[PDB]
Amino acid sequence: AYTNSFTRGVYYPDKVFRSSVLHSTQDLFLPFFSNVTWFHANPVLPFNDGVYFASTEKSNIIRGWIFGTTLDSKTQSLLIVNNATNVVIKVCEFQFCNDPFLGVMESEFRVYSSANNCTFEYVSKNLREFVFKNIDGYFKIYSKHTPINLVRDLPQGFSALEPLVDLPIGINITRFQTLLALHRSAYYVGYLQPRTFLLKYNENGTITDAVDCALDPLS
Amino acid sequence: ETKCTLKSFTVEKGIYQTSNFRVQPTESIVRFPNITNLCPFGEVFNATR
Amino acid sequence: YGFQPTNGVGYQPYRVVVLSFELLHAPATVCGPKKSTNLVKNKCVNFNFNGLTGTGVLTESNKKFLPFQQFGRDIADTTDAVRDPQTLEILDITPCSFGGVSVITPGTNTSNQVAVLYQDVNCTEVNVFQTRAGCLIGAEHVNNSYECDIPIGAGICASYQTQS
Amino acid sequence: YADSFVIRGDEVRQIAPGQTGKIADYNYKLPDDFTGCVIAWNSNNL
Amino acid sequence: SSALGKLQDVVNQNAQALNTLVKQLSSNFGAISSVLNDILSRLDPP
Ligand SMILES: *[C@@H]1O[C@H](CO)[C@@H](O[C@@H]2O[C@H](CO)[C@@H](O)[C@H](O)[C@H]2NC(C)=O)[C@H](O)[C@H]1NC(C)=O
Ligand SMILES: *[C@@H]1O[C@H](CO)[C@@H](O[C@@H]2O[C@H](CO)[C@@H](O)[C@H](O)[C@H]2NC(C)=O)[C@H](O)[C@H]1NC(C)=O
Ligand SMILES: *[C@@H]1O[C@H](CO)[C@@H](O)[C@H](O)[C@H]1NC(C)=O
Ligand SMILES: *[C@@H]1O[C@H](CO)[C@@H](O)[C@H](O)[C@H]1NC(C)=O
Ligand SMILES: *[C@@H]1O[C@H](CO)[C@@H](O)[C@H](O)[C@H]1NC(C)=O
Ligand SMILES: *[C@@H]1O[C@H](CO)[C@@H](O)[C@H](O)[C@H]1NC(C)=O
Ligand SMILES: *[C@@H]1O[C@H](CO)[C@@H](O)[C@H](O)[C@H]1NC(C)=O
Ligand SMILES: *[C@@H]1O[C@H](CO)[C@@H](O)[C@H](O)[C@H]1NC(C)=O
Ligand SMILES: *[C@@H]1O[C@H](CO)[C@@H](O)[C@H](O)[C@H]1NC(C)=O
Ligand SMILES: *[C@@H]1O[C@H](CO)[C@@H](O)[C@H](O)[C@H]1NC(C)=O
């Protein structure tokens, strides 16, 4: 299936506060009214320039992503996981199952079978959006958690995404996947292009509205 | 100063812009995030073997 | 090496560490620990917050950033606020007073007395009389109204009477 | 002004208007507003 | 109380010009940055 975003995938493109103004930016955005894939419950996707990624549930079936160029050994990759404990970022050379996942006893993690040469570690319904990008050896992640009053369909509205993480890795990326918690006892993928937007800033400094300046003559 | 900026030993009545003025910085300050990690240069320079 | 404690120097063991700094072609990496001097307020200073470099006078403010926002800027894109990275308090930035200087002359063919106007400057930062055109030094403020002789501005004029 | 001396064969490019180097930063400097000639010829036979 | 466009236009023109003047303090014109404290920090005087 395919679906239509309406006004989705807007993130704060810098750390700068702004009071009641209209500011114009050039960056990598998800164009308004786009053609976003639909997935149910998954396969190896491309990256090619950033990614928008939403998801919907009350349980937690979406348990992180895996990135990289080959998703195996012989080249390095990232791995972002969340068991019922908390997030586990990790950067080694792995050996990934071609269909990697984790179970739910509640024993799991048939994800990889190798953790060699680790160069970075870290340990510690609902709509959960994420924007992933990778520039100059930094892997930036923006995110937002809005509550839907549906269960698993893409809604309409405006909600800007706030920066979360910054990782000075150096890693090359060309592909990525997803991770799901099996049954033993809905998600979308947009892509980002270089656009020019007009963001409206509140008096507290939040982005409340935007204009995509390449949609139509009025814009 | 008027005679210099007007290039003349006589000046006529009026008001004349002669120079600018500005306050100079008293000192310098520096701010930066707290302290964390700072690398553990005690494992290689402090090994038992 | 058969090391033994009763060996002359130059035969006793030395431990060696060789640090080798390399610079491939990445985006960045390890660096030194930048210093951090105290933070003053209400004086023209040269500040530096994390790399934000400028000069001016810092006061405390009534803004509220967003937890991830590190400094503010206005229309025309000048920095007019900042967050300091240790208190987590936001501070207003105001340029350090400046202006022009004008001299009021009654004509050198009449006198050598002069008055001085410091344009749009408060009088504290330089008998002494505060106009809306700036701070005026060397002229007496009388209460009568004459025709304008030398225009000062915002309704005020000056003149050489009687002698002053 | 004739300034006459002897150097190592490498830092002959260190006698130039405007530069950085261990010979130029410590033992001999020329202004960036230099005006004149620089002559160098080899010597281990003297 | 419910037309002064000729007075509004001269205000607008002057403000639009003063803003364009300040917005030019952030162009390179073919330099490495727009800040003098950045050319005086990663370049030698020559
Ligand atoms: C290795 O560890 C020791 C002990 O923690 C450090 O020795 C300290 O050195 C300082 C400065 O010379 C003294 O004031 C302390 O008294 C020492 N420690 C003790 C326990 O007395 C030493 O500096 C460390 N080496 C390095 C390279 O950091
Ligand atoms: C950086 O370290 C300083 C230590 O001086 C911390 O200062 C204290 O801040 C806490 C707030 O969490 C106050 O309750 C204390 O009264 C402060 N003590 C002193 C001596 O200033 C500061 O909080 C730390 N900042 C960060 C980023 O954690
Ligand atoms: C998205 O692109 C596919 C490509 O064939 C097309 O079939 C589909 O109709 C498009 N969806 C929308 C909403 O335009
Ligand atoms: C969650 O997964 C990480 C991945 O290595 C692991 O380190 C951690 O121990 C797991 N949680 C528990 C409770 O074992
Ligand atoms: C990465 O792992 C392989 C196999 O374990 C090893 O041969 C190689 O030396 C490792 N890389 C580095 C930089 O040591
Ligand atoms: C990423 O892959 C490209 C392939 O064209 C390669 O040229 C580049 O060096 C790789 N990135 C890094 C940091 O080596
Ligand atoms: C945030 O914005 C709202 C509306 O714009 C305003 O009423 C409020 O005072 C602001 N500050 C808050 C909520 O701290
Ligand atoms: C200027 O001085 C000369 C010489 O004393 C005099 O003749 C002339 O009247 C003066 N001009 C005036 C008073 O306006
Ligand atoms: C000048 O400074 C004084 C001293 O704080 C202040 O009270 C006053 O409001 C300022 N402005 C004028 C126009 O006096
Ligand atoms: C000018 O007149 C006012 C009347 O309100 C008075 O308060 C003030 O002291 C007078 N100043 C002088 C210098 O006479």
Look-up: residue for tokens 């200087």? C101
Distance, in Å, from the CA atom of A127 to the CA atom of A9, rounded to the nearest integer, reads 13
Task: Quote the number of domains for chain A.
Answer: 1
Task: State the DSSP H helix or E strand holding residue E8, giving kind and residue range, or none if neither.
Answer: helix E5-22
Do A1 and A173 contact (CB within 8 A), yes or no?
no
Q: A81-106: string of b/e by CB count within 10 Å (b at 16+)?
A: bbeeeeeebbbbbbebeeebbbebee
Nearest alpha-carbon partner for C47 in E38, B25, B28, B33? B28
- Domain span at A219: 2-219
As beta bridge partners, residue C47 has C54
- Count of H-run helices and E-run strands, chain C: 0, 11
Q: Which two tokens stand for residue C164?
A: 């002053």
Three-state secondary structure call for residue E10:
helix
Chains in touch with A (≥3 Cβ pairs < 8 A)? C
Residue E28 contacts C, CB cutoff 8 Å: no
Is D19–E46 a contact, with Cβ atoms under 8 angstroms apart? yes
Structure-determination technique: cryo-EM
Chain E residues within an 8 Å CB radius of D20:
44
Residues 6 or more apart whose Cβ sits within 8 Å of residue A203: A19, A20
Question: Which of C44, C99, C150 has the CB atom closest to B21's CB atom?
Answer: C99
Residue C29 contacts B, CB cutoff 8 Å: no
As beta bridge partners, residue A77 has A92
Is C69–A205 a contact, with Cβ atoms under 8 angstroms apart? yes
Question: Is the beta carbon of B42 within 6 A of some atom in ligand 1?
Answer: yes
As beta bridge partners, residue C79 has C73
CATH of the domain at A191: 2.60.120.960
Nearest atom, ligand 9, residue C122 CA? 1
What resolution does the deposited structure have, in angstroms?
3.0
Q: HSE on the CB side for A181, CA within 13 Å?
A: 15
Distance, in Å, from the CA atom of C8 to the CA atom of C2, rounded to the nearest integer, reads 13
Q: Which strands make up the sheet holding A51-53, listed edge to edge? A: A51-53, A127-135, A138-146, A162-168
Query: What is chain A's Cα-based Rg?
Result: 18
Rounded to 5°, the CA angle A193-A196-A202 comes to 120
Distance from E29 to chain D by nearest Cα, in Å?
25
